[PDB]
C-alpha cells in the first residue's frame, strides 16, 4: 500500500519480472496467447474504487471488469499448473539459499514446512496462492487477449514404480497340498482393485511368470474380466474394492469354476465353466497373483464358518473348503524378492555352459555362452555368474617357479577369457561374497554397496578404519586402457587372492593393475563375472595358475590344498543370480506388543514370548535355511 | 530430533520393519510390490524460460 | 509362347502350386524363412501376372496365393503389400485376386493393425505397414471413384477399401515424415525390375574417415592373405600361377598406392552410399583417437562375434540392397550390349532368397561391424522436424469423414438436379457414374466403417475403449453433420432410391447410433447444431403432415409417398435415436427448448397415429410402438405426470419463460401441453379395467401394441428418479413413479396375455415380454418369487396347449 517509490525497490522488481517470466510460462507449458483489438483492451473499463478499497499512499487500486471474464476449464487447470510451478520456482530459491524442510518453521536452522510437493501443500495457502495468479491471468484475459489453453493429454503410467526386478508377488499353498482328485472351494477377497489374479497352479509354476501365461496355472484376471490358461480370453466381469471370489476346482469332472460375490461368472457363451478340460498332472493348488500397492487375502475354509459366499454357493454343490480337515494352519509359499546365486540349469532359454577338460597345453575351463544369440526374441540384459566355491582367506592376518614357494604360499589365482568380439566394457571380473544379491539392469562399480567402519581411541584419533564390501571386481573396458578391436587375441583377465593377507589384485594381459581391494580375515570371496553379451559366445572360466602361485582348486578343495596341478572337480560348477525361487512364510511370528506410552515415555516395544527355528546351514554357499 | 522428518499430513507410528507379522491367516493381507516414494525427496524442478 | 515356358507352366500350375495348396498349413510357423517365403509370393504374383497362361492356371495360381497368404503371418507380407499397393490401384483386370487378397489378410490380421497392442505373439505395424495400408485405401478409393461401373470389380473393390479401413486405426496420425530416400528401384511403371543406385558422384568423403578407409583396407588386405595361405598361395617374390605364387601377401605398407585403391575403392563407394542417403557417420573420439596416438604374418580383425543394434541392422540390409542393385544394373548393361539373355539374379533384392543376399549382407554388415569397433558410429541424419501429432487433420478419420461429406454433398446436388430435370429428355442424367459409385461404394462403406469403430466415436473423457480411441469434438461434429446429410437426402426419396433406400436407413440407423450429442451440443459448429435441429423439426413436420393424411384420406402421389416414406424410413430413424439417446442419456443434452418443443409434436403425432382407428395405421401400429417407447425412454421431461414437471429443471415451462412461450405455439399450460396424452393415473386405470373387462387383442389392440410399451420405457426412465430412490428432497423428484407403480403394471401386462393365451395369439406377446424384459429387472427380488407364480403357471398351463401361441 505503497506507491513504487518507497516502497521497496527489489519487492517491486520481484513484482515486475514474476510476472514476466508468468508469462513466460504461460506460452511455455503451451498456451496460445492472441489479442482480438488493443481497442478491445480499451473498451471495457476500469473500475476507481472507493474509499474503503483505496489505500492510505495513494497506489490508487484500479481493477478491470473481471466480472464477465470466465475461463473454460483448460484455462483453470492452466492456473493451477502454473501455481504449482511458482511453487516449485520459489522453493527451488530457497533450497539454494539452503533451508530445508521441517515439521515446524526454525530459522535459526533454515528450516520451512512449506518445502514439500505442491501436492502435499497446505489448502490455505496453495489456494490463496492460486486465487491471486488467477485474477492476475483473468485481468489479461479480459484485456482483449484470449489465452487458448492447450488441451489436456491423458498420460498412462501404469502406477508400477516397485523394484526394477518385480512387478507382482505371487502366493500359493505348499505344494504337498495338491489335490489330485475331488471337489475343492477357497476364497480371496480384494482388498483393492486391480491388477490381481487368482486360481489354481500346478506345484510347478515358476513365481516370476505371470499367472496364466503359460500352462502351469488356471486364473481369473477380474481387473480386466479375462482368463488365463496359455493367453486370455474374455471371461465373467470386473471385481470392486471389497469383493470375494470363490474359485472351485472339481477334479473328477476336470471343471473349474469361478464367483464373484456369490454369482457364478460366465464366459462369453452361457457356459459356467471357465477351464473344462485339463489333465490331473499331479494336482492343483490355491495361488494369486498380486500387482503394484494390491492387497488381498486368501481363505482355505479352516474354519467354515469364516466363508462369506461358500453357502450360497459351493455347499450344496459339493464342493469342500481347501482346509476342511487340516488341524494347523496352510504353509503359505510366496515368490522370494531377493535373487539368489543357482546351478545354470540344461534347459535355460539363454544361458549354456560348457565344461572344457584341462590338456597338457590348456587349462581347465568353463565356458559361458548364449543360445538365442542371433536370433529374436533374445534378452539383452546383464547376468550375475559366479564360481559355487568361495575361497576363505585367513583367519588371522601375518604382519618353473620355486616348489618350496608354492607349497608354503597362500595364493590362488584363477582367470576370464573374454573372448574376440565380445565387448570388454560389458565384462566386469572380480570376487563377490555371499552377501551379493543385487539384480539390477544396470549395474556399474560405482552403485557397489560398501561402507567403512572406524575404529579409535578415547581421544578420536583414527588408530584404523575397515573397507567392507561385498563386490570386489574390475572391468575389463577400462582394465584394457588401450582401446583395441580386442580380436587379435581374446582378452585374459587374471584374478590373483593372497588369502594369507586379504590382498585381490589383477592382471590384463600381463601387466598389473591399479586395482586391488584388501579384505577382512575369514571373509569368503566367490569367482564372479558379470556380462552383458554381445556374442553367441560370452567369456571362459580359465582355472589355470601363473608363476608362484597356486591354482583355484588347491584353494577351493582341502584335498588339494598341495597339488599345483590346476583341477576343475565336478562340485565346481557356474551358477547365476536368478528370481525363480520361493520363500516360506512362517507359521508363527514373533509376538511384539508396540505402543505410544506417553509424550514424555515415547514408544514402547515389548517381546517376551520365545519362539525358535532350525536353520540348514550349506557350508560352500556360506548361507543358510529354514 | 528424528520426530522432524514427518511428513505434514501423515502421522508418526513405530511398526515393523517387514509387511508381514503375526496375525489369523485368513484375515493376513497378502501384499504385491509397493510404489516408490517420489514423495520422500522434494527436487523442485522448474519448468525452464 | 516358347515350348518351354509353356511346358513349365503346365508343370507348376499342375503338379507344384496344387502340392504348396494342399501343404499350405505347414506355412504356419515358419518366421526364420521371411527370405524364402518372399522370394515364393512374389514369384507367384510375378508370374500371376502374364499373358501365356490359361484360366485354369490362373485360378490354380489364386488358390495357392490366398491359400498360403490365410497362413503367413502379417508381417511376412509386407512387400507383397507393397506390390500390391503400386499395382492394386490400376484396378485391371489382373487386379481382382489382388484385391481378394488384401480383403482376406486384412480381414484376417485387422487386430494387427487397428490395435495398440496388436495380436500378442505376432505384435502390431511398424508404422511403415500401417503407411502402406492408409495409401492402398486411397488410392483404390480414387481409383474406383474415377472408374467407369464394372460389377465384379466394384463387388470386389468395396470388401478390400471396408477391410483396410477396418484394419486401419481410425486416430492413425499420418507420418508427415514419409519414408526418407524411399528406393524405386522394386517399384516402376514399364517392367517390374528396374535398378537404380543410389547416386555416388557429388558425395566427397570427409578427410576424418581417411583412417578408417586406411584400416579397412589393411583389415581386407590382411583377410585376403589368411584366405591366400588357406588355400595355398605362396608368397610372391615374383608371381608364378602354375606353382600357385602371389606377390600380394607383402604387407600393405609395401603395397604400392597405384595398387591400394583396388581395396580402398569399394570402401569409398560404400561410404559414398552411406553419406548420399544422409546417415551421418561420427567419432567416438576416445578410442580411435588414441589408436592415433599410439615374413608377413596374416592377422586381421576377428569380426564375427561383434553384434549390431537392430537400426544399424536395417541400415546393413538398405546397403545390400545396394550392392545388389549395383550390380543387377552392370549385369542389365552387359546383358543389354550382348543384346538378350537374362540371368537369374536379375531380380530384387527382395526376391533373391537368403543364399544370394548372403555375400552382400555380409559386406555391408562387415563394413558397419568395423565402423563400431573401430568407434565410429552410424545414425540417421535425418530427424523430424516436427512431430505435427496433436493436430487432427492428419488423423485418417479425419479426412475420411470430409470426402465422404463432400460425397454427400455432391450426391445431394446430383439428386436435385435429377427431381428437377426428371421430365426433360434427359432420362439418363449426366451423373450416372458418379451416383451409382455413391449408392454402390459409399453407403456400404459408411456402414461397415461406422460398424466396426463405434466405440471410437462415442468415446469421450468416459470409460469406453480406455486403451486407445477417443475421437476428437471436430471428428463427432462431422459425424453429426454426415447423419443431418444423409437424413435430409433420404427425405422423400424412398420412391428414387428404393434398393437403395434400405442402404441409407441402415447408415442412419447406425450414425445415430455412433452420435455423440453432449460433445456435439457442448463443442460445436452452429451450422451442425442447426442442423441436427432442422433434422428433428423435419421429422416433426413429416410427421404432423401423416397425421393430417390419416384424416383426409379414406378415399385411396403425394398421399402414398408421404405414408410410405413415414412407415420405411422415418419410423426406424426415429427409433434408433432414441433408442440411443435414452441409453445414452443424452436428452439432456439436446432436447431442450426448441428441439424441445419440436420433440413435443413428435409425441402427439406419434400418439395419434398409434391410437388412431383407421385400417391404413392398422398394418403400421406395431413400428409406431416401437418409436413411441423409444421416445418415452429418450424424452427428458415426465409428460405423462404432467401435475408437478414444475419441478423439472429441464422443461420449457420451468426455463423458456412465458414471454418466449406464448411467441412459441405452446398451450401456456402444462396439462394442455398434450391434450390427447391421458395422465399416469388414467393409464393405470384403463389397464386395470382392462385384463378384468377380457378384452380380445383384436376388440382393441392398440393398448397392448403401442401404449403398454410406452408405459414400460417410461416406467424404465422415471422410475430412477423417483421419491422410493430419492427419499433425500423428497417432493422435489419430479415424478411419483414407485415401484408399486412397477409391478401394478407388470401383474396387469400378465394377466392380460394370461387372458389372451387362449386364442388371439400372434407376435405381439413376444414383442412386448420383450418390451417389459427391462420393467422386470427393476423389481425387487423378494417379491419377485412368488411373484413368478403366475409366470410358470401359463408358461406351462395355458401355454402348452393344442394352440400353438407365443
Ligand atoms: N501474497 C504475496 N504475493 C506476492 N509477494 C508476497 C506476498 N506476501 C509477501 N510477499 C513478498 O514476498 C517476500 C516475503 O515473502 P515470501 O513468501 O516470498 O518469503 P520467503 O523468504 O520466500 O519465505 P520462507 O522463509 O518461507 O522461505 C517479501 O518481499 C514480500 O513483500
Known sequence: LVEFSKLPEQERNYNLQMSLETLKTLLALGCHVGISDEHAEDKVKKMKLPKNYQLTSGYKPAPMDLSFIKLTPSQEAMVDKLAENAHNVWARDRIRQGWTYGIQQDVKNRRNPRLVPYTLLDDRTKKSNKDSLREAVRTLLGYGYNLEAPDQDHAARAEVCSGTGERFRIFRAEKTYAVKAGRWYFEFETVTAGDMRVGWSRPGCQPDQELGSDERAFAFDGFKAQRWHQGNEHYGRSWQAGDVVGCMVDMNEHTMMFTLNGEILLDDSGSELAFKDFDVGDGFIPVCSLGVAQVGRMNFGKDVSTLKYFTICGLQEGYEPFAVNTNRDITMWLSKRLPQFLQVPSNHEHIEVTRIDGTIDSSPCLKVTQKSFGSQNSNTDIMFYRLSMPIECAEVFSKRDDYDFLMQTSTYYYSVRIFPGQEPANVWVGWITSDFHQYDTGFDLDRVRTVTVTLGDEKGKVHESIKRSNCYMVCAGESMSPGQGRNNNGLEIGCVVDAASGLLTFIANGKELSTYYQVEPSTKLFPAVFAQATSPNVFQFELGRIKNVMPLSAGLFKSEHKNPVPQCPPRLHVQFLSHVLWSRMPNQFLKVDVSRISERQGWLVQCLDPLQFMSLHIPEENRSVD | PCYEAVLPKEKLKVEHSREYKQERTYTRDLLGPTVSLTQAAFTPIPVDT | ?806
Open chain 3, 1 to 806: 509362347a516358347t515350348d518351354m515356358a509353356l511346358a513349365l507352366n503346365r508343370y507348376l500350375c499342375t503338379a507344384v502350386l496344387p502340392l504348396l495348396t494342399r501343404c499350405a498349413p505347414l506355412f504356419a510357423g515358419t518366421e526364420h524363412h521371411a527370405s524364402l517365403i518372399d522370394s515364393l509370393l512374389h514369384t507367384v504374383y510375378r508370374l500371376s501376372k502374364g499373358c501365356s497362361l490359361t484360366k485354369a492356371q490362373r485360378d490354380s495360381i489364386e488358390v495357392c496365393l490366398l491359400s498360403i497368404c490365410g497362413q503367413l503371418r502379417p508381417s511376412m507380407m509386407q512387400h507383397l503389400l507393397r506390390r500390391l499397393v503400386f499395382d492394386v490401384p490400376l484396378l485391371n483386370e489382373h487386379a481382382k485376386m489382388p484385391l481378394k487378397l488384401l480383403t482376406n489378410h486384412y480381414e484376417r490380421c485387422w487386430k494387427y493393425y487397428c490395435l495398440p497392442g496388436g495380436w500378442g505373439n505376432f505384435g502390431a505395424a511398424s508404422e511403415e505397414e500401417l503407411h502402406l495400408s492408409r495409401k492402398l485405401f486411397w488410392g483404390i478409393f480414387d481409383a474406383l471413384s474415377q472408374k467407369k461401373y464394372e460389377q465384379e470389380l466394384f463387388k470386389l473393390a468395396l470388401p478390400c477399401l471396408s477391410a483396410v479401413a477396418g484394419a486401419l486405426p481410425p486416430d492413425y496420425m499420418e507420418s508427415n515424415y514419409v519414408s526418407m530416400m524411399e528406393k524405386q528401384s522394386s517399384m516402376d511403371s514399364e517392367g517390374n525390375f528396374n535398378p537404380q543406385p543410389v547416386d555416388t558422384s557429388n558425395i566427397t568423403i570427409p578427410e576424418k574417415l581417411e583412417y578408417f578407409i586406411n584400416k579397412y583396407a589393411e583389415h581386407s588386405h590382411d583377410k585376403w592373405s589368411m584366405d591366400k595361405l588357406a588355400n595355398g598361395w605362396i608368397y610372391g617374390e615374383i608371381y608364378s600361377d602354375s606353382s600357385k605364387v602371389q606377390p600380394l601377401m607383402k604387407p600393405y605398407k609395401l603395397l604400392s598406392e597405384k595398387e591400394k585403391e583396388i581395396y580402398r575403392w569399394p570402401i569409398k563407394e560404400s561410404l559414398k552410399t552411406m553419406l548420399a542417403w544422409g546417415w551421418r557417420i561420427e567419432r567416438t573420439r576416445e578410442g580411435d583417437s588414441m589408436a592415433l596416438y599410439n615374413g608377413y604374418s596374416p592377422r586381421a580383425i576377428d569380426m564375427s562375434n561383434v553384434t549390431l543394434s537392430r537400426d544399424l541392422h536395417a541400415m546393413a540390409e538398405m546397403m545390400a540392397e545396394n550392392y545388389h542393385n549395383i550390380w543387377a544394373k552392370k549385369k542389365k548393361m552387359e546383358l543389354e550390349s550382348k543384346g538378350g539373355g537374362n540371368h537369374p539374379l536379375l531380380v530384387p533384392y527382395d526376391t533373391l532368397t537368403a543364399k544370394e543376399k548372403a555375400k552382400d549382407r555380409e559386406k555391408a554388415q562387415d563394413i558397419l561391424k568395423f565402423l563400431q569397433i573401430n568407434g565410429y558410429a552410424v545414425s540417421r541424419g535425418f530427424k523430424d522436424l516436427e512431430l505435427d501429432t496433436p493436430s487432427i487433420e492428419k488423423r485418417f478419420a479425419y479426412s475420411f469423414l470430409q470426402q465422404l461429406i463432400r460425397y454427400v454433398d455432391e450426391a445431394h446436388q446430383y439428386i436435385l438436379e435429377f427431381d428437377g430435370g426428371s421430365r426433360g429428355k434427359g432420362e439418363h442424367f449426366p451423373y450416372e457414374q458418379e451416383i451409382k459409385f455413391f449408392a454402390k461404394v459409399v453407403l456400404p462403406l459408411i456402414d461397415q466403417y461406422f460398424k466396426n469403430h463405434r466405440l471410437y466415436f462415442l468415446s469421450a473423457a468416459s470409460r469406453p475403449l480406455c486403451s486407445g480411441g477417443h475421437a476428437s469434438n471436430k471428428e463427432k461434429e462431422m459425424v453429426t453433420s454426415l447423419f443431418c446429410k444423409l437424413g435430409v437426402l433420404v427425405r422423400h426419396r424412398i420412391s428414387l432410391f428404393g434398393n437403395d433406400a434400405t442402404s441409407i436407413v441402415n447408415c442412419l440407423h447406425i450414425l445415430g447410433q455412433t452420435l455423440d450429442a453432449r460433445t456435439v451440443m457442448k463443442t460445436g459448429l452452429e451450422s451442425v447444431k442447426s442442423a441436427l435441429r432442422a433434422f428433428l423439426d423435419n421429422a416433426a413436420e413429416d410427421l404432423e403432415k401423416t397425421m393430417e393424411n390419416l384424416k383426409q384420406g379414406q378415399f385411396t402421389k403425394g398421399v402414398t409417398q408421404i405414408i410410405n416414406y413415414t412407415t420405411v424410413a422415418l419410423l426406424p430413424m426415429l427409433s434408433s435415436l432414441f433408442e440411443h439417446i435414452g441409453q445414452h442419456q443424452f436428452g439432456e443434452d439436446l432436447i431442450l427448448e426448441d428441439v424441445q418443443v419440436s420433440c413435443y409434436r413428435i409425441l402427439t403425432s406419434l400418439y395419434a397415429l398409434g391410437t388412431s382407428k383407421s385400417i391404413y395405421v392398422e398394418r403400421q401400429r406395431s413400428a409406431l410402438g416401437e418409436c413411441l417407447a423409444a421416445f418415452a425412454g429418450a424424452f427428458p421431461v415426465a409428460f405423462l405426470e404432467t401435475h408437478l414437471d414444475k419441478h423439472n429443471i429441464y422443461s420449457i415451462y420451468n426455463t423458456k419463460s412465458s414471454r418466449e412461450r406464448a411467441a412459441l405455439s405452446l398451450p401456456t399450460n402444462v396439462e394442455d401441453v398434450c391434450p390427447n396424452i391421458p395422465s399416469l393415473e388414467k393409464l393405470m386405470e384403463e389397464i386395470v379395467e382392462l385384463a378384468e373387462s377380457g378384452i380380445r387383442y383384436t376388440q382393441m389392440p392398440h393398448v397392448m401394441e403401442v401404449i403398454l410399451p410406452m408405459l414400460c420405457s417410461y416406467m424404465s426412465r422415471w422410475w430412477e428418479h423417483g421419491p422410493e430412490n430419492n427419499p433425500e428432497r423428497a417432493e422435489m423428484c419430479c415424478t411419483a413413479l414407485n415401484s408399486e407403480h412397477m409391478n401394478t403394471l407388470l401383474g396387469n401386462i400378465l394377466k392380460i396375455i394370461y387372458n389372451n393365451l387362449g386364442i388371439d395369439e400372434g407376435a405381439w406377446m413376444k414383442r412386448l415380454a420383450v418390451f417389459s424384459q427391462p420393467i422386470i429387472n427393476k423389481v425387487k427380488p423378494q417379491l419377485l418369487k412368488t411373484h413368478f407364480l403366475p409366470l410358470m403357471e401359463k408358461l406351462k398351463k395355458k401355454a402348452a396347449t393344442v394352440v400353438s401361441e407365443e
